């Protein structure tokens, strides 16, 4: 507690591990989060630590056996209230209702972008939004997938995220005019959406692995991509691309 070895942990935490083992053979652990203590069988960071908040809530920190995953759970005096799982790569993921079911969930990516679900029901539906660098996409959640939607005029851009995180993008236009109706094709291999108007390609939208969006225009004849892809930094730039 001063006879101890310090171990760095995911989630900006540190745990102190005894060198000598306690009265009953196990190593004791001290990690300040409110100070939590516990006893484990290894002399690394792994183990379980308990504690009690000043408001009578009980805290349970579970450090993974390979030191790459902390699980911070907060209970009432018994019933889950919180469950933050932070990882070594800075990635982290909840609030519960009275029935012990998931009520909210925030997925923080390693790069800082977030995916927030609010008002989750028993069937699995709720309100969803993704926080990117510079703008926020909003949509819904279902037990099937996450759909984020951007509207401009009669055009609707839909970004779909499957359960495993696979991104696919759709576009629909309720415009009746063959001269102005936007259609699009999705190339999942290159993760690129090519928009077409009046049987000419107009622009490519690329949804990168860095959770960003780039736009590149074709020439007036729809023949060649021109210039270089420009990164989108504002929500109005997405709507402009959809005009």
């Amino acid at each position: 507690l001063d006879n101890s070895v310090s171990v760095d942990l995911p989630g900006e935490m540190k745990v102190l591990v005894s060198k000598e083992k306690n009265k009953d053979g196990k190593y004791d652990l001290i990690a300040t989060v409110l100070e939590l203590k516990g006893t484990s069988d290894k002399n690394n960071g792994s183990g379980v630590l308990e504690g009690v908040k000043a408001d009578k809530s009980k805290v349970k920190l579970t450090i993974s056996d390979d030191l790459g995953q902390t699980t911070l759970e907060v209970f009432k005096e018994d019933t889950l209230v919180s469950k933050k799982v932070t990882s070594k790569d800075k990635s982290s993921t909840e609030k519960f209702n009275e029935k012990g079911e998931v009520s909210e969930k925030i997925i923080t990516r390693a790069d800082g972008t977030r995916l927030e679900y609010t008002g989750i029901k028993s069937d699995g539906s709720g309100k969803a939004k993704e926080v990117l660098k510079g703008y926020v996409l909003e949509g819904t959640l279902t037990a099937e997938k996450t759909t984020l939607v951007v509207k401009e005029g009669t055009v609707t851009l839909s970004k779909n995220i499957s359960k495993s995180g696979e991104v696919s993008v759709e576009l629909n236009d309720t415009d009746s005019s063959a001269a102005t109706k936007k259609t699009a094709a999705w190339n999942s291999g290159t993760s690129t959406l090519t928009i077409t108007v009046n049987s000419k390609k107009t622009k490519d939208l690329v949804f990168t692995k860095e959770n960003t969006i780039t736009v590149q225009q074709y020439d007036s004849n729809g023949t060649k991509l021109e210039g270089s892809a420009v990164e989108i930094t504002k929500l109005d730039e997405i709507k402009n691309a959809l005009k």
Partner: antibody
């Protein structure tokens, strides 16, 4: 963004001529470059365009087979050349980035063909 | 080829006055792909408007374009001394690209 054209030319009929247009300040290879003729006291005429990255060349029917448009992508330059000049070729020749409207213009090359 | 006719050949107006220039095409211009240019003596042309009504970067908004199909208009809402020059229209809705014959805007006196 800029297009630099080569200097004024005074040639005799029958001579060959190649003029150039070098872009800077942007990715020259990924925008069409066009050529535009303006005869003395006259309006503008489109001659042709080239996409420098792959040398996709498209001429106006009024000039196809009369001039050759080319590009040296490695040095960001587009060219316009005649194999045999006539007095009727006396004009100002502009290059312009083509979108396919003309959004960036060079200052023009004055070509005088005379005996 | 789409022929572009510009009328009239010359506008005579005073500074501060409204200018209206006509560009008419022999066939309907696809997607209103119609551009306008300004040219002063001894200088290269300069893009003012593309897509019939979109203003190029840095061009003052006293220049506005409108129209569709075969009938297009360049309006200079209030003429400045530097606006008296020759103006050209150009269509890129079909190949080959073609220019109008130009309208000169001169000072009335």
């Amino acid at each position: 963004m800029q297009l630099v054209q080569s200097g004024a030319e005074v040639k005799k009929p029958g001579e060959s001529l190649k003029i150039s247009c070098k872009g800077s300040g942007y990715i020259f290879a990924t925008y069409w470059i066009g050529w535009v003729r303006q005869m003395p006291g006259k309006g503008l005429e489109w001659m042709g365009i080239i996409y420098p990255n792959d040398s996709d060349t498209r001429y106006s029917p009024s000039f196809q087979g009369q001039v050759t448009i080319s590009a040296d992508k490695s040095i960001n330059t587009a060219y316009l050349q005649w194999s045999s000049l006539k007095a009727s070729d006396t004009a100002m020749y502009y290059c312009a980035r083509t979108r396919w409207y003309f959004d960036l213009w060079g200052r023009g090359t004055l070509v005088t063909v005379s005996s | 080829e789409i022929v572009l006719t510009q009328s009239p050949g010359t506008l005579s107006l005073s500074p501060g006055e409204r200018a209206t220039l006509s560009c008419r095409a022999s066939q309907s211009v696809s997607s209103s792909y119609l551009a306008w240019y300004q040219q002063k003596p001894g200088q290269a042309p300069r893009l003012l408007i593309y897509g019939a009504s979109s203003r190029a970067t840095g061009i003052p908004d006293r220049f506005s374009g409108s129209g569709s199909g075969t009938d297009f208009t360049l309006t200079i809402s209030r003429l400045e001394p530097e606006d008296f020059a020759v103006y050209y229209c150009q269509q890129y809705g079909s190949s080959p690209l073609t220019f109008g014959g130009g309208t000169k805007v001169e000072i009335k006196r």
